[PDB]
Design a protein around this ligand. Structure first.
Ligand SMILES: *[C@@H]1O[C@H](CO)[C@@H](O[C@@H]2O[C@H](CO)[C@@H](O[C@@H]3O[C@H](CO)[C@@H](O)[C@H](O)[C@@H]3O)[C@H](O)[C@H]2NC(C)=O)[C@H](O)[C@H]1NC(C)=O
Ligand SMILES: *[C@@H]1O[C@H](CO)[C@@H](O[C@@H]2O[C@H](CO)[C@@H](O[C@@H]3O[C@H](CO)[C@@H](O)[C@H](O)[C@@H]3O)[C@H](O)[C@H]2NC(C)=O)[C@H](O)[C@H]1NC(C)=O
Ligand SMILES: *[C@@H]1O[C@H](CO)[C@@H](O[C@@H]2O[C@H](CO)[C@@H](O)[C@H](O)[C@H]2NC(C)=O)[C@H](O)[C@H]1NC(C)=O
Ligand SMILES: *[C@@H]1O[C@H](CO)[C@@H](O)[C@H](O)[C@H]1NC(C)=O
Ligand SMILES: *[C@@H]1O[C@H](CO)[C@@H](O)[C@H](O)[C@H]1NC(C)=O
Ligand SMILES: *[C@@H]1O[C@H](CO)[C@@H](O)[C@H](O)[C@H]1NC(C)=O
Ligand SMILES: [Cl-]
Ligand SMILES: [Zn+2]
Lengths: 192, 596
């Protein structure tokens, strides 16, 4: 059975603060659709070669997908300390996989301003690697309590990109797919 | 959490909230300046009023942090900018009247027209009607009419408004812990917090006046030479020892003496480095001019213009079907958006100006990584200096020839290079006494040293003493000749043009030394020089995070402005001037006037 990589050609990608993960079990993998394509803006791999991956086997593959700003794609890498990496999506230092991103300004940015894609600006303590937070609790920045209401030193933790087609390249919406390769002890994704 | 910790997360919430609202306000104002309609003039205010309402909301929210409790100067810098009560410290009826007179003054200046008493059906406004007269006319009475009409028609309309404009703006500054409105304007150069680099608002007055006296030898000798040439153009009108009539200086106010080149050229026999016809013979358009300017900044190590720049900028007038504001501007809308608004014609002046405006964008592109409140020049005079050093290198004959605009057989004699320096002196050094005398008058008016019974009297006393210029007809206190200038009636500071003139030659002297240039400073081109590019890029990316005393020191190595580089630029011209003025009186008499 063919692996369902056609996560990439999904219609709607999730916000980076609430990214989604799909498990890829027993199936034959089609890695050749990737390394013969200049459709991506990054295509950066870690721990594994981009072409030696064809004849490799993993226990299972996990496809993380989300949307981040153009200048925030650099934070989708092991050992990054930005707002996205610390508060939205953290990669482990021993990350073994490939991050892919392609410009989607025409479909994720409207002239009125697409505010659906959000990110977390404030969070107590950085995120563990591969952790995920969806809580919209009013972040308390001071020492007096926030009673579920916003005001001074009580800000909403989620901030939304104002994606618009006239922005610079560094502020245009980029859809990201972080393919991670797991290896435990048991045999399922191959291509010898 | 510490007060500094609470202020950092506050600025983080502000920077992301302000950048989105500022972009909608900037793009809305772009759609108006490029497409003057009724929907866009209201969208500019709708998006503009929401930004001002958001700013006042964030003003008081920022005042909850005691400025002395913050130790990180970067956040301490941003807090003081937000906590500025600004013009909102006035009551509603005073703030609404101040915004009214500021709009009314800006209206009767831009829409003020005078009519020819000889041909009443031909009426003309400042641009382009009245400005064309002051720029090209050689008739004394014709220049006298346009000069006096502009100050008697629209100048008197601004007199009662400017009196209320001063008293309302003074109360705004005294409430924000300043002496007067002039003290408020001089705060742009103030540096407080950095050890060894502090700088007070009174140090500006001391530094510009001490350096202005070092410029008097060059300006007086040019004034004597220009007076001698102007005597030949207006015989029996100019005393060889008196001041110059204000209407014979080349424009409406005498701010720049550039249009006097046709009367003051040292060697008119030499070929004119005007490549306007040469640009047409090569079938150039506005795209070719800006694409060539893009090629200039890349050769020194700077990047191309952004992809959105070539998509969104307005490099030509979109025709008569869609009227726009044709004032050359460089727009920094944030969010990676960089545009230039300029109705470019196929001429040489628009070619050099295209490098100035693109220089502003290179400055805007560099500090884009800084936080929102720090994305600006070091002081008000840094942007204008960065833009001029681009046109300075792009105006040298060797650069103009190597582009393809001038023939490769142009002999650069000591006569063609003295004609070039004289043209540069009429603009660069001619405006220095005009700028100081204007700001010195505005400084005294806000300090109350010049009462209303001698507003115009003390104005023209300083015109004779400081600038060496006399009014052609006497003006009482009904006139308001300073307000007949744009920057005065539109609430713009003017000392920024004095400092940028000195900064641009400190910048030029530093980069040309790194550019391995050997000849005179006025023959330098920093093209192909990545050494000078990286040296300058260390300054533009700094923005306003570091004080201007450091930013200026980072490139040239000085905590303050210096008049020496300016004098070195015109030193070959200075000696030629002293040779001409041996049998001519150097200086002016403050008592001569073209009437009795
Ligand atoms: C005053 O506050 C500012 C802002 O909080 C401080 O600047 C920040 O300094 C930290 C390091 O202490 C920078 O973190 C670095 O971020 C880069 C991002 O590429 C990362 O690669 C590094 O590994 C490091 O984590 C942070 O970026 C920087 N912020 C800005 C806007 O530049 C400043 O240090 C404070 N002043 C003092 C004296 O501490
Ligand atoms: C340093 O800056 C100078 C200033 O423009 C550059 O000189 C000009 O460079 C262009 C192309 O790099 C030359 O165009 C060529 O012209 C010849 C004319 O025979 C033509 O046959 C070629 O096909 C091409 O179009 C231009 O002539 C040249 N200027 C002069 C006066 O020779 C120079 O290239 C810069 N150095 C670099 C970029 O390394
Ligand atoms: C000039 O401004 C108008 C709005 O003031 C722009 O938009 C037009 O708006 C009307 C009103 O909804 C629409 O019916 C038109 O279809 C819009 N477009 C045009 C071309 O009229 C207009 O686009 C602006 N002009 C340019 C050249 O950008
Ligand atoms: C997505 O669709 C395009 C064409 O519609 C195709 O070229 C591409 O390979 C597809 N991607 C995947 C991962 O199947
Ligand atoms: C601004 O004005 C308000 C009252 O109008 C005052 O309480 C506040 O202290 C002022 N803030 C500053 C920084 O001057
Ligand atoms: C700038 O754009 C031109 C377009 O042809 C390209 O050739 C050049 O390499 C670009 N340079 C930089 C620094 O982006
Ligand atoms: Cl005047
Ligand atoms: Zn400019």
């Amino acid at each position: 059975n063919l692996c369902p990589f056609g996560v990439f050609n999904a219609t709607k990608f999730p916000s980076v603060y609430a990214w989604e993960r799909k498990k890829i079990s027993n199936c034959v993998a089609d890695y050749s659709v990737l390394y013969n394509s200049t459709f991506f803006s990054t295509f950066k791999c870690y721990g594994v070669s981009a072409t030696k991956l064809n004849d490799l086997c993993f226990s299972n593959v996990y496809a993380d997908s989300f949307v981040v700003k153009g200048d925030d794609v650099r934070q989708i890498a092991p050992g990054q300390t930005g707002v996205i990496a610390d508060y939205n999506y953290k990669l482990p230092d021993d990350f073994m996989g490939c991050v892919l991103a392609w410009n989607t300004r025409n479909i994720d940015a409207t002239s009125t301003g697409n505010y659906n894609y959000k990110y977390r600006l404030f969070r107590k303590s950085k995120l563990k690697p591969f952790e995920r937070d969806i809580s919209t609790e009013i972040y308390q920045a001071g020492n007096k309590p926030c009673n579920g209401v916003a005001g001074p030193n009580c800000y909403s933790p989620l901030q939304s990109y104002g994606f618009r087609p006239t922005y610079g390249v560094g502020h245009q919406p980029y859809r990201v797919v972080v393919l991670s390769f797991e290896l435990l002890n048991a045999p399922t994704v191959c291509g010898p | 959490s510490t007060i500094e910790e609470q202020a950092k997360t506050f600025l983080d919430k502000f920077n992301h909230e302000a950048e989105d609202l500022f972009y909608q306000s900037s793009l809305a104002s772009w759609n108006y300046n490029t497409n003057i309609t009724e929907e866009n003039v209201q969208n500019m205010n709708n998006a503009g009023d929401k930004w001002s309402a958001f700013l006042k909301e964030q003003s008081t929210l920022a005042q909850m942090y005691p400025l002395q409790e913050i130790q990180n100067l970067t956040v301490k810098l941003q807090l003081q900018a937000l906590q500025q009560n600004g013009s909102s410290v006035l009551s509603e009826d005073k703030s609404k009247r101040l915004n009214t007179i500021l709009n009314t003054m800006s209206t009767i200046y831009s829409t003020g027209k005078v009519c020819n008493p000889d041909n009443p059906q031909e009426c003309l406004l400042l641009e382009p009607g009245l400005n064309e007269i002051m720029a090209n006319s050689l008739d004394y009475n014709e220049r006298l009419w346009a000069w006096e009409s502009w100050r008697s028609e629209v100048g008197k309309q601004l007199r009662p408004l400017y009196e209320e404009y001063v008293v309302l703006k003074n109360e705004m500054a005294r409430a924000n812990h300043y002496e007067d409105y002039g003290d408020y304007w001089r705060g742009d150069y103030e540096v407080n917090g950095v050890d060894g680099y502090d700088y007070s608002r009174g140090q500006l007055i001391e530094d510009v006046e001490h350096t202005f006296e070092e410029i008097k030898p060059l300006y007086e000798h040019l004034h004597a030479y220009v007076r001698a040439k102007l005597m030949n153009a207006y015989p029996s009108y100019i005393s060889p020892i008196g001041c110059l009539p204000a209407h014979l200086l080349g424009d409406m106010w005498g701010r720049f003496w550039t249009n006097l080149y046709s009367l003051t050229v040292p060697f008119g026999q030499k070929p004119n480095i005007d490549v306007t016809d040469a640009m047409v013979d090569q079938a150039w358009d506005a795209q070719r001019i800006f694409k060539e300017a893009e090629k200039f900044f890349v050769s020194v190590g700077l990047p191309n213009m952004t992809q959105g720049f070539w998509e969104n900028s307005m490099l030509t007038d979109p025709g008569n079907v869609q009227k726009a504001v044709c004032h050359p501007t460089a727009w920094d809308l944030g969010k990676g958006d960089f545009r230039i608004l300029m109705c470019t014609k196929v001429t040489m002046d628009d070619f050099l100006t295209a490098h100035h405006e693109m220089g502003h964008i290179q400055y805007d592109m560099a500090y884009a990584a800084q936080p929102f409140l720090l994305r600006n020049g070091a002081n008000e005079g840094f942007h204008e200096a960065v833009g001029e050093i681009m046109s300075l290198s792009a105006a040298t004959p060797k650069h103009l020839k190597s582009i393809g605009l001038l023939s490769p057989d142009f002999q650069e004699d000591n006569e063609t290079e003295i004609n070039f320096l004289l043209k540069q002196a009429l603009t660069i050094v001619g405006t220095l006494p005009f700028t100081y005398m204007l700001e010195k008058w505005r400084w005294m008016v806000f300090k109350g040293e010049i009462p209303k019974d001698q507003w115009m009297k003390k104005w023209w006393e300083m015109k004779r003493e400081i600038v060496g210029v006399v009014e052609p007809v006497p003006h009482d206190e009904t006139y308001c000749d300073p307000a007949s200038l744009f920057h005065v009636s539109n609430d713009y500071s003017f000392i920024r043009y004095y400092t940028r003139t000195l900064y641009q030659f400190q910048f030029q002297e530093a980069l040309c030394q790194a550019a391995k240039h050997e000849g005179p400073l006025h023959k330098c081109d920093i093209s192909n020089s990545t050494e000078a590019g990286q040296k300058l890029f260390n300054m533009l990316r700094l923005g306003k995070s570091e004080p201007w005393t450091l930013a200026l020191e980072n490139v040239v190595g000085a905590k303050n402005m210096n008049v020496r580089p300016l004098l070195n630029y015109f030193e070959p011209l200075f000696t030629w001037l002293k040779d001409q003025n041996k049998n001519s009186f150097v200086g002016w008499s403050t008592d001569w006037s073209p009437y009795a």
